[PDB]
Design a protein around this ligand. Structure first.
Ligand SMILES: *[C@@H]1O[C@H](CO)[C@@H](O[C@@H]2O[C@H](CO)[C@@H](O)[C@H](O)[C@H]2NC(C)=O)[C@H](O)[C@H]1NC(C)=O
Ligand SMILES: *[C@@H]1O[C@H](CO)[C@@H](O[C@@H]2O[C@H](CO)[C@@H](O)[C@H](O)[C@H]2NC(C)=O)[C@H](O)[C@H]1NC(C)=O
Lengths: 453, 132, 106, 122, 132, 453, 132, 453
């Protein structure tokens, strides 16, 4: 009767929150391209078919993406395999020579500017004695003036000699399925109404995540994981001025970025087996690279998000936008990659409106920089090689990264401003559904049976 | 027909369900616990984290009277200072996650209680076997 | 002890000919009979195991037969290198014993 | 390959003692049964002693003409076979061969013979 | 007839022998299964593959009724669609390598049968233990 | 009775074919030589005595040596520890200077040619300011002319700057016992008549192979694993023209390779702690390095292999030989190592015969090259340092690597031609006895017993 | 009060005590046997060395009759050529470290005896189970 | 009765001596200092509180510290993390330039000598074309003359180009708790009278050692592990002349090392992101660095150790001291580190006395060297950067390392001389209490019970 006895129960469903090292599962279809034409396609794991996305009925679960882990590790190792993909490539040290640069041959109007300088210099050949005198073309955002004549030098020539990039590798995003080890499950919040914090009353357990494409955009998140029904905005304290507003909208916005220079390549020999690809002639005209969005679509999407912003800031609130008042070139701009080349656009024809509670396209004139200091590390840059022909890509703008304007008065307007900042916040638009739990069997419960002898 | 997908749940299927329905199939959480030059050491460090925390619970299970039986009675009585709950509820009212909070102070006393309750009865089988 | 009697003690044959060597046991050694060749200045070399079983590395011209007490070693085209002393040996009982040998000379 | 190389042979006065050795290599020594067989100056072959292999029982066997006089032993760690002879007779004079048997059911035959070491008792 | 032939009663010793002589020594293949600066991590990933494929068979054996008995009867009958051979032959005619070819289609049916025949005997033991 | 029941059997002899990573077993006697004078003498495992070669009675087993593994892993890691024994050594970058080379001081006959050029250049000392003007000696197979006067440069100065070799290490082959891990056996075919494929009805199980010497010869396999009784040949389709004929003959053929120049060394200081060993004077005369084989042995061995080839191509077949029509210098030649220096001989007095079914020595004029691109990798070479004194070695030719001539007519002749090709096939002359199985216990058999309750 | 830290010792507490007092608590040496970019591989090669030498003893334990019972009688008699000591002393006079020196020659004869005494008892259990 | 049966015993207290890889346990309080300001503060393990030091009653154990292990592994990995902390730092190749050095501006007395030379040279800037002409100051123990005029070069410019040290890291010692892995115990000898060998009748088992400070002194051990009651001396054969006598005393001896030059730093730019820290001006006067010990304390310590030395050499033995007859500059001197700079003192006003059985301070004039070749490896040195301001530290002399004078006559005096020699002998003053054993359960004993069927 009352002589209740301890009975243990092994293999019993309970879990605790934890954090351990997860691994890839690259899709097996991306294994056909041979021997790392992109980073991390042979290094980590081939995937599985039909991942067991299984519901967990009558389960509510307090998810989180702000104090969440596993978005720090994915940023950590993606940094790490970016450094893994730069050790084979050729260091570009012997380019720190005193340049001699003139204007490129072009119809120089005073309104437009010479974007590309000539910069004929001296460089060692494969023989150690001789030094050929070679020329190139260079953007104005890569040379500074050494101070008649006009002689420049590289901007990164101060403080950071950095490598070239091998044309075997490619900067494309491939899908990545993160998988838990044995003894760990991955909870996925299936709730169609789920802000940042709060219990998610419809979860489901997987073992491997869906294919995540690791991209790097600061503003205008691209090419991934559209929302279900509405345009959901989610943040930390909405009465904070330091916390970004991760907008994630429902329908995609088509972007049409291009670069109309032909940009012929050529190979200069640095030394023994060290080629260097420099842009030779540009055939045709020197025209500016741009991006396009539909004005009816972009204005309709801002009509959507100005409706959803009033859900948090009340009605009769004169919501307006502005264009990220100041900062460096890498936070005020939509800095991204397209086919292996690095566009810095100018979202100032976009973020410029004001909204009260009552066919053509917008062209964004972008600009390209060849050395690259993503994640703003101290002693690195990255000489991206030139690429042949006209360059054009098409992508889906999926989510924004806004930032409120830190008012302190009893006003109605709210001049929202875009701002990228930390790149982890991109992956919080991908890792907000998923948490990782630790299966903890071997429970214990009293019942009326005793181990007889 | 016979054989339907309604009552045949999956891994962690009854994880919110009561104990009388979670304890029908415990083997499913048991058997999906081991199977299912730098990206090889994350495979290494997922494996060498899995087999020790598998062996540690299989050792705490092994050193009680329960070798691999996965459900086993014992001899220690249930002091009501631990849980103070009724019996007729705690197999169909509460749930297992509510239990692990309801007992988590008193664990490592129960696992500590189990070692002497195994070894005292253990030495009593040897003292029983020695005389004959 | 088992006495093994080999017959003939000596035999002269021209290379290319064939021979039948006899070994007779005082008790049944049914399959316990092995044949060895010992050439001059050499150690003996196993020719046939357990009355009839051929040995890897020994030419196919060596063949054995016989059962019980009466055994025969056939060499079906004798080569120059085959000439020497021939022994039968039994493992039916202790002590192990040999036949007296057939000496084949050219 | 299988090698058995005997040593220790010599000229011994009658009544004396002598230990022969056979150094083996090329096979798992302890598993095989080993024997001493001697060949008399008239070229007759006489089995002298046997020590069984590890899976054969490891006993020793001797014919009556040497029993109480000859002792066969093995040192498996050094792959060596020994024959300790005492109360020697002039009839013991012979070339002594170390021999290894075969394997399994069809392996009680002598499979390998050594070169031999000569003992003369006179 | 004196039986002087050498026998190697060692690892994989009876690998061609009949079942009545192979089941005499099963421990010899069992016990030589675990023990015996860049070529040390091939030692690490060879060791944690050895202990992994040891743990996989020790888990599939463990979750059947055979904890460590290494030979154990069960309750499932032998459907003749699997082997259709006589009983009086298959313990002294054939060999184990002939068995693995003779059954390899019918594996993963037997491993699936073993789990329900263990968990059914397991829960019938619990239903026996619950009433008393 | 008929109620037969399942009974599992743990620890049961069955195996499947598999492939996993094998490891060393260096001989413990080779541990006295300190700190890797040969590769892999401290890095991997000291061996065991008396490896348990145990017979498997009544066992036949389908071996294979062409679709065999473990000759790819041994070639893989031997490549890797070859790079491990080159990572400590000194990089030889500052030698890419425009040389100026004349003939060496010698009695220049028009029939012979200058094999060694003088090549006096400039090179920096350990001080960054001073530049010594040093001279050397160089072979004709290492300089090309930059185009009066005559000034050369290194041949590898295009596309591959490559290291010197540290005189601590030695290029001798040491035996290597490959061993399987736990749960894996190594089947060894004990059949004295065993070609490549086919069921081997006499196997035996080991755990560690016999001591393999890793050599590098293209034609004329050396110093290893002679055949038992006959001259054994083995191939793939003998009616294929792309598959080599791995000849393995029974008796060794003694070669007497030498180099009769004295070839005095000297040490030039490259920089801080960077010595460079260059050949100074040669004492005596400039004579050609050669090799010798016995003509009585070579003609009998070709008499053997023309019998075994007629065993596959019938009798009355007029077998003749020729001399490997074309290719590079490392495939047309018997390219090998001798004491640390790299002879390239000329097997064309050898492979020149014809055979119908009815005391002196052969001298092979060799030639030496100092940079080395063994395995023909893309961005490597290998400056072998000079060595003191007269050089002479003696080796056993053990096996050939022939290649038929792809006729398509109803002729009788078969003009065989030697050809090395892939170096893995050398090690297929060592790894044809061994296959690696995975012990798979826990079988299952029905018998008449039931688990009682 | 009741419960003091004097006779409630810790790890290796009775390591000098006699066998009759060391066999009182054997579990305390049992539980401290699993738990407790270049300084991570010294963690890896210490962990997979700890779990390997734990599994090797759990395998040699597994193939005798003693799965995890930690104290078990057997069927082999005690040949006095091993120890030749009195019984009334060897549970309260000598100590365990004195035993391991006093017996270390005779292990692997005993260890070979245990496997055959288990597998013979195993097949005799199967021959008993086979007739019924 | 007499039918005794085998009973195995799992979990049974016995241990054997072994050797396996140990690991760190850094104290968690030293984890606040971010990202390796000292080596191995993030790399290895945070410690535990209250390590279970548990007595082992009725246990005697034969310890040893001379054939002890675990002082070789700690020297091995401390070598290894010393090399781990030098791979990020900048290589100092382009400093091998022909110097031109004059005297520093100072009141040159003829008795003193110019310790610091001027040495103005040329060195390339970050541009490859330009070459700046910079000046420094350098010690006399770092330049040799290339041979009117007087022009020097670096001393290490022969044979070993070696790195700078990054000023983020610091060479200060932090405590290190060595811990055994699972299945291994650490025996600690608690005997208050315990020389090297001998049974220690009071042991205790731990899992983690107490906090060891890794210091680097050759003579005059510092800052660690004072003795308990007396001044204990310990050696190997005290009638040997090759075995050092490790004195370890009970009360600390306070040292007061300083450097009163101001020694202003400056940063010369070598190239892209390669700074080089050179000592600029010295503010004030050029005075010699010294150390102080109390003469009453030092004479009191020799009054202690001449009593304890007579315990091994009998009474009426006229013990005298001398000053380490010969050796290198790093063995004839008290060579140590203080705040990141390397003092070489002169213990010859100290070790100079004689003792028969019947307030002021001693100042030791030290001297600083900037390149450093600790452990006397072949191809390494270590340019320690300069540091700002007056430098001063205070340390406890804890133990000496003496060495007798190998007499061979029937004399009474014993002129002892200090000598460092191997640096491992320092760490044997810290790891003599601890040995590591391996727990081997599953014993076996006969008793009267049989496994019933
Ligand atoms: C390295 O050189 C670059 C350009 O030569 C420096 O960048 C500018 O330096 C001037 C110095 O007067 C400043 O006024 C500018 O503000 C700098 N540019 C920016 C964008 O801040 C740079 O300061 C130099 N030093 C380092 C450490 O990079
Ligand atoms: C690198 O240069 C070397 C020599 O300067 C080239 O080798 C030869 O180049 C000439 C060109 O005049 C060709 O006629 C020969 O055929 C080349 N040799 C061979 C064996 O083909 C070499 O081609 C250059 N390129 C590389 C990649 O090595």
């Amino acid at each position: 009767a009352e002589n209740l006895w301890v009975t243990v129960y092994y293999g019993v469903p309970v879990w605790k929150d934890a954090e351990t090292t997860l691994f890839c599962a690259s899709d097996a279809k991306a294994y056909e391209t041979e021997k790392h034409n992109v980073w991390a396609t042979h290094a980590c794991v081939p995937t599985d078919p039909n991942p067991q996305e299984i519901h967990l009925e009558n389960v509510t679960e307090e998810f989180n993406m702000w104090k969440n882990n596993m978005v720090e590790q994915m940023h950590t190792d993606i940094i790490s395999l970016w450094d893994q993909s730069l050790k084979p490539c050729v260091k570009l040290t012997p380019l720190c020579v005193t340049l001699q640069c003139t204007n490129v041959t072009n119809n120089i109007t005073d309104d437009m500017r010479g974007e590309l300088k000539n910069c004929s210099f001296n460089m060692t050949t494969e023989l150690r004695d001789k030094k050929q005198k070679v020329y190139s073309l260079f953007y104005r955002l890569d040379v500074v003036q050494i101070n008649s004549n006009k002689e420049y030098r590289l901007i990164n020539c101060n403080t950071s000699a950095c490598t070239q990039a091998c044309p075997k590798v490619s900067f494309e995003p491939i899908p990545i399925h993160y998988c838990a080890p044995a003894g760990f499950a991955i909870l996925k919040c299936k709730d169609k109404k789920f802000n940042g914090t709060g219990p998610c009353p419809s979860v489901s357990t997987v073992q491997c995540t869906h294919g995540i494409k690791p991209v790097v955009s600061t503003q205008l998140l691209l090419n991934g994981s559209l929302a279900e029904e509405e345009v959901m905005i989610r943040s930390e304290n909405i009465t904070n001025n330091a916390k970004n507003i991760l907008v994630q909208f429902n329908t995609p916005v088509q972007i049409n970025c291009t670069r109309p220079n032909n940009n012929t390549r050529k190979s200069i020999r640095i030394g023994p087996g060290q080629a260097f690809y420099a842009t030779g002639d540009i055939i045709g005209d020197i025209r500016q690279a741009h991006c396009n969005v539909s004005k009816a679509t972009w204005n309709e999407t801002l009509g959507k998000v100005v409706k959803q912003l009033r859900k948090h800031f009340g009605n009769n609130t004169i919501i307006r936008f502005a264009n990220s008042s100041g900062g460096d070139l890498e936070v005020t701009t939509h800095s991204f990659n397209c086919g292996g080349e690095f566009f810095y656009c100018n979202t100032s024809g976009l973020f410029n409106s004001t909204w009260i509670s009552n066919n053509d396209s917008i062209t964004l004139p972008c600009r390209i920089k060849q050395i690259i200091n993503m994640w703003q590390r101290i002693g690195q840059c990255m000489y991206a090689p030139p690429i042949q022909g006209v360059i054009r890509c098409v992508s889906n703008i999926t989510g924004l990264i806004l930032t409120r304007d830190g008012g302190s008065t009893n006003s109605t307007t709210e001049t929202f401003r875009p701002g990228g900042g930390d790149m982890r916040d991109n992956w919080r638009s991908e890792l907000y559904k998923y948490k990782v739990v630790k299966i903890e069997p071997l429970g214990v419960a009293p019942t009326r049976c005793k181990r007889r002898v | 027909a016979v054989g339907i997908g309604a009552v045949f749940l999956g891994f962690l299927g009854a994880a919110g369900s009561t104990m009388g329905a979670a304890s029908m199939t415990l083997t499913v959480q048991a058997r999906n616990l081991l199977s299912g030059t730098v990206w090889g050491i994350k495979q290494l460090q997922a494996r060498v984290l899995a087999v020790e925390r598998y062996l540690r619970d299989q050792q705490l299970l092994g050193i009680w009277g329960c070798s691999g039986k996965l459900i086993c009675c014992t001899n220690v009585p249930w002091n009501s200072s631990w849980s103070n709950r009724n019996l007729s509820e705690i197999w169909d009212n509460m749930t297992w996650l509510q239990w692990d909070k309801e007992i988590s102070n008193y664990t490592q006393i129960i696992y500590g209680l189990l070692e002497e309750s195994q070894n005292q009865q253990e030495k009593n089988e040897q003292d029983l076997l020695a005389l004959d | 002890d088992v006495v093994l009697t080999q017959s003939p003690a000596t035999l002269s044959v021209t290379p290319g000919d064939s021979v039948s060597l006899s070994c007779r046991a005082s008790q049944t050694i049914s399959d316990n009979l092995h044949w060895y060749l010992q050439k001059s200045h050499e150690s003996p070399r196993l020719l046939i195991k357990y009355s009839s079983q051929s040995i890897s590395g020994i030419p196919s011209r060596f063949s054995g037969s016989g059962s019980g007490t009466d055994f025969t070693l056939n060499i079906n085209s004798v080569e120059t290198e085959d000439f020497g002393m021939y022994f039968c040996q039994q493992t039916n009982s202790w002590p192990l014993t040999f036949g007296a040998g057939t000496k084949l000379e050219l | 390959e299988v090698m058995l190389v005997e040593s220790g042979g010599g000229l011994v006065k009658p009544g004396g003692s002598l230990k022969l050795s056979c150094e083996a290599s090329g096979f798992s020594f302890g598993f095989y049964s080993l024997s001493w067989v001697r060949q008399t100056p008239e070229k007759r072959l006489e089995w002298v002693a046997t020590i069984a292999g590890s899976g054969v029982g490891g006993q020793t066997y001797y014919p009556d003409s040497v029993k109480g006089r000859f002792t066969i032993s093995r040192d498996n760690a050094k792959n060596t076979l020994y024959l300790q002879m005492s109360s020697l007779r002039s009839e013991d004079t012979a070339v002594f061969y170390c021999a290894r048997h075969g394997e399994g059911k069809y392996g009680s035959n002598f499979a390998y013979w050594g070169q031999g070491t000569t003992l003369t008792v006179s």
